[PDB]
């Protein structure tokens, strides 16, 4: 399924994501370092924060405990639709999604 990370310079690139990956495994396997897991996608640290584009902040599963309580360590500010990359798992309802990518994280 289809995925849109657009850069902090409006650099936009799509990436064909299978089911049950997340989109930090997608991104760091592309080459979009900007969203890097430090901790390997386990909710322990931030640096693969990102800003999920309004037009799908529904459509996506709500954050869970752990990654409300390590959102609050984002380097970048820290916005209404930030999510940790590595909880948001593809599926083909999320065809189309698009988030932009913070270029700080640290
Ligand atoms: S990679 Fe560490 S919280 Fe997402």
């Given at each position: 399924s289809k995925v849109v990370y657009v850069?902090?310079?409006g650099t936009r690139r799509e990436l064909?994501?299978?089911?049950?990956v997340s989109l930090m495994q997608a991104a760091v396997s592309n080459?979009?370092?900007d969203i890097?897991?430090?901790?390997?996608?386990?909710?322990?640290?931030?640096t693969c924060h990102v800003y999920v584009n309004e037009a799908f902040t529904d459509k996506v599963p709500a954050a869970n405990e752990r990654e409300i309580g390590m959102l609050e360590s984002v380097t970048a500010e820290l916005k209404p639709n930030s999510r940790?990359?590595?909880?948001?798992?593809?599926t083909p309802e999320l065809d189309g999604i698009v988030v932009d990518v913070?270029?700080?994280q640290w």
């Open positions: 850069s902090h310079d064909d994501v299978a089911d049950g080459g979009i370092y890097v897991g430090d901790c390997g996608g386990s909710a322990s640290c931030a940790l990359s590595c909880q948001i798992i593809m913070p270029d700080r």
